[PDB]
Every structure is written in C-alpha cells, then in structure tokens.
Amino acid sequence: YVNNKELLQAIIDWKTELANVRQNDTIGLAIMLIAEGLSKRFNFSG
DNA sequence: TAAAGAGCTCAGCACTATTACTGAGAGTATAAAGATACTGAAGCAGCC
C-alpha cells in the first residue's frame, strides 16, 4: 500500500504543529487505504 | 362469675437505599491480506 516511513513523518509533523486547527489528509487518505485493505483480510470479508 | 377495659405484638401494604450489573469508553503500536427478449428513448456520434 503505502510507505510506513512517510507516515511516521507526517504524524511527527502534526505532533509538532499540535504543539502550537486541522491535520494533513495524506495520513488520512492512508488511513482509509489501510482500513479498506485490512477489510480484505481473510477472517473478515466473508 | 364474666362482660368489659387498655395494651403486646404479629399479618399485611410501602420505601429507600442497595447491589449486581449491564452498558459506554477508552486505551489498543506483526502483518500490507457471469446462458430472456423486446420495445423504446435520449445521448452520442459522424455529415453536407
């Protein structure tokens, strides 16, 4: 799906900003992505 | 002797405080996981 590392980056960055409102959606798109990919796991998707 | 006091405490309907107790919530950091048939109607598509 998606490089875990870049996600660490984005979230570190929203950490730093929340240390000041919203967050980037890059990480949010990736979240949708990973949710939907897990959905196709084998116990579920049944 | 026996009708008649005044009270000693036991059925019989609540009440408040209770006690499991079921629900709402908040933590979660390995993975990449298909054998109708027909008619019709606008839209699309090429043309002088």
Q: Is the dihedral of CA A34, A35, A41, A45 positive or negative?
A: negative
CB atoms within 10 A of CB A28: 11
The long-range contacts involving A22-28, CB below 8 angstroms and separated by at least 24 positions, are none
Tell me the CA–C1' distance in angstroms for A19 and B18: 48
Q: Please list, in sequence order, all residues whose beta carbon lies within 8 angstroms of the beta carbon of residue A22, skipping any fewer than 6 positions away.
A: none
Taking the stretch 11-40 of protein chain A, residues with Cβ within 7 Å of any atom in nucleic acid chain B are: 34, 37-38, 40
Closest listed residue to residue A27, CA positions, set A10, A41, A44, A12: A10
CA atoms within 13 A on the CB side of A22: 5
- What letter represents residue A16's amino acid? T
What is the distance in angstroms measured between the alpha-carbon CA of A46 and the sugar C1' of B10?
Answer: 68
Q: How determined?
A: cryo-EM
What is the distance of C-alpha A29 from the center of its chain? Answer: 6
